Amino acid sequence: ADYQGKNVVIIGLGLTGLSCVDFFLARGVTPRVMDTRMTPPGLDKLPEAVERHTGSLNDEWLMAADLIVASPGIALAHPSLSAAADAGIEIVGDIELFCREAQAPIVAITGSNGKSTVTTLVGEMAKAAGVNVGVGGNIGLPALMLLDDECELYVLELSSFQLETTSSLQAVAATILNVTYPFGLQQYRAAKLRIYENAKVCVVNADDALTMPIRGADERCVSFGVNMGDYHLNHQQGETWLRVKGEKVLNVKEMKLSGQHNYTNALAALALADAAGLPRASSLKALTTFTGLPHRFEVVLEHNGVRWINDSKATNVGSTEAALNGLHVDGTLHLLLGGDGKSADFSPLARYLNGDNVRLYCFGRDGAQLAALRPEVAEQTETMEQAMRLLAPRVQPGDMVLLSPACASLDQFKNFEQRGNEFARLAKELG
Ligand code: NI
């Protein structure tokens, strides 16, 4: 598309906004930028020629724009943007700008959880095939930074926020992994359903009806699931295989990923790669080489028959449910739950907490809430380190120590990554 002579305003000076700045500069267009923060750190990176307004949105600039490029996020709800729409001013996001300029097929992935694992893994399948692939979007580099005439395939992770502002995506294959929001619930689902519009192939979760396109399944749909679907899992005394269209394709022992959820992520990835035309042999190869992302049901230690699992990326009840459903534990599960639950209903976790082989170690702001799930088997401490010092002397060969806390880490940590890193350090110290 041609932006010459347009009055362009970018909202947001994070890396995504800066990518949009670079995008217009490269096309001879000097956009205006604004950010509600007083000193966003992107400031220091702007060219001198770019007019900037910070500390709030500038209504006059928005109302004078020919195009508003909105960084994705709660900012999309700001009443000044809504006023700009009412005046007929075009509003788009970086993903729309990208789709207009992309000169290679797009694989598009959204979902409440599993999206980064799946996006990365489809990336690795393309790399295994020798395909010049650009991987990013809502994870890694923002999408505009991936644009390159040499690119043969793009694999994008997309948020609901990004999809709200995207009208030009025609993915070669797209998925909603699952659906577990500023604009309300219907809006959240509706936004994800945008990903299927003009997608050649839709990869749906057989286990989550909300991932099905609006009007139902259609001829474009390929499913992945635990017990059934085009891509599913098959389990026979001691062994689990990925199964595709009726055929086992890989024993999971050949994969580095562990856990039912990552296996379904592997299936969804395979299905997207198969739909994108990637060769099957190299995509299987990638399944055997891919280590997994840190903090995503990641095995950080396995000594003396005890596996220590960092699932710190589980910051909500849906993520933890996904970690708990189909969990395989020979001996006792030692489950660490805690942090800032953000007023969540934890009860869905309770289904998974019966039997004689579960111990709970609860901590952080809402530790009390979490222990109340089954007080009989719960301890409560202030910190995860304290909880880990309680369980460590109790573990026995056969056990699993799982950090899947169902809460945000911000009461005690900088982010879920620091929480997982500390968990790994302590596991190594104690285990
Ligand atoms: Ni050892």
Author numbering: 1 to 180, 187 to 437
Cite, word for word, the article reporting this structure.
MurD catalyzes the addition of D-glutamic acid to UDP-MurNAc-L-Ala, generating the dipeptide moiety L-Ala-D-Glu in almost all bacterial species. From a structural point of view, Mur ligases are three-domain enzymes that share a very well conserved ATP-binding site that harbors the Gly-X-X-Gly-Lys-Thr/Ser motif and display notable structural similarities in terms of domain arrangement. The N-terminal domain is involved in the binding of the UDP-precursor, the central domain in the binding of ATP, and the C-terminal domain in the binding of the amino acid or dipeptide. Crystal structures of Mur ligases reveal that MurC, MurD and MurF display at least two distinct conformations, namely ‘open’ and ‘closed’, with the position of C-terminal domain dictating the nature of the conformation.
We achieved this by solving two intermediate conformations of MurD which we named Intermediate Free MurD (i.e., intermediate conformation of ligand-free MurD) and Intermediate Bound MurD (i.e., intermediate conformation of MurD with ligands). In the solving of Intermediate Free MurD, 421 residues were refined. There is one minor region missing between residues Thr180─Tyr187 since it could not be traced in the electron density map. Notably, Lys198 is not carbamoylated as it is the case in open MurD structures. Superposition to open unbound MurD structure revealed that the new structure was clearly in a distinct conformation. Only Arg302 was found to be differently oriented so we focused on this residue because of its position in the hinge loop containing residues from Thr294 to Glu304. There is a difference in the orientation of Arg302 as well as its interactions, when compared to the previously solved closed conformations of MurD and additionally orientation of Arg302 in Intermediate Free MurD is different from all of the orientations found in the aforementioned structures of MurD, which contributes towards the intermediate conformation adopted by the protein. Thus, we were able to ‘trap’ an intermediate conformation of MurD that is not open despite the absence of ligands, nor closed in the presence of ligands. This suggests that it is not substrate recognition which causes MurD closure, as previously suggested, but that domain movement is an inherent feature of the enzyme that is independent of ligand binding.
